[PDB]
Amino acid sequence: GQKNDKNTLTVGVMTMTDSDKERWDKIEELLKKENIKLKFKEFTDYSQPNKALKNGEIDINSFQHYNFLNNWNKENKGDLVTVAETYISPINLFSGTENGKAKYSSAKEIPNGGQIAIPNDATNESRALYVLQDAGLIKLNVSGDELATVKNIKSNPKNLDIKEVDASQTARNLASVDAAVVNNSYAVPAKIDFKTSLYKEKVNEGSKQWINIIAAQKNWKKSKKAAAIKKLIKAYHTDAVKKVIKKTAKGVDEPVW
Ligand code: MET
């Protein structure tokens, strides 16, 4: 059956944006030459694909950054591994909206006692708190690779309430809160207007932790899928695919190969 078919790979992804479709189209097209067939399982929530991969419902996934992976392994006693890097996806603080329009043109306009929604998984929660500091809204007593929670807020001059919600729910909150940090995987399908960005995460040598990856089981190299996974990586790391991602996700996803 499929799990023991050397020429089929089942890939776990989030609900596909148009740019996701186009890039996986090109990968598929390139993999015909190798007689590999791709199948996709789409997930709606970040807690799902690593569970599905451990359970062997999928052969690899392509949805997360290194941090999320390491953290997920820890919370779950998992042993999933990184097989390759894909793109980085600098995250934004987006203005809350009223009848669809931005309430604020810059972070400094966020009112005293206002509310900001962020992801509630350790690594994206922390990522978002670092963006708030960069946007000039808060100060943290922790720096660099060190994880942050609300407990690390040592300055909050506008007395903002930080509402920790699921990464999948930050977008939905924008109509109810003053601003939210929203992963692009969610921001694009929610059809958020990116003019409402009040701050875009910066990319430096310290951003390797937010590089997205393809993940597999620890023993994938001894599995029926080893050859197909290697071929998939070669197909992903082409100019053809790099061009597709840059064209269709310029400023959203940036290939790192
Ligand atoms: C599930 S960890 C977050 C991954 C998302 N694609 C990002 O780079 O923000």
TrEMBL record:
Pfam families reported in the protein's UniProt record: Lipoprotein_9
Listed InterPro entries: Lipoprotein_NlpA
Entry GO terms, CC: membrane
Chief localisation class: membrane
The entry's keywords: Lipoprotein, Membrane, Palmitate, Signal
Membrane topology: Lipid-anchor
Subcellular location: Membrane
Family indicated by similarity: Belongs to the nlpA lipoprotein family.
Protein name: Lipoprotein
UniProt organism field: Streptococcus mutans serotype c (strain ATCC 700610 / UA159)
Gene name in the database record: atmB
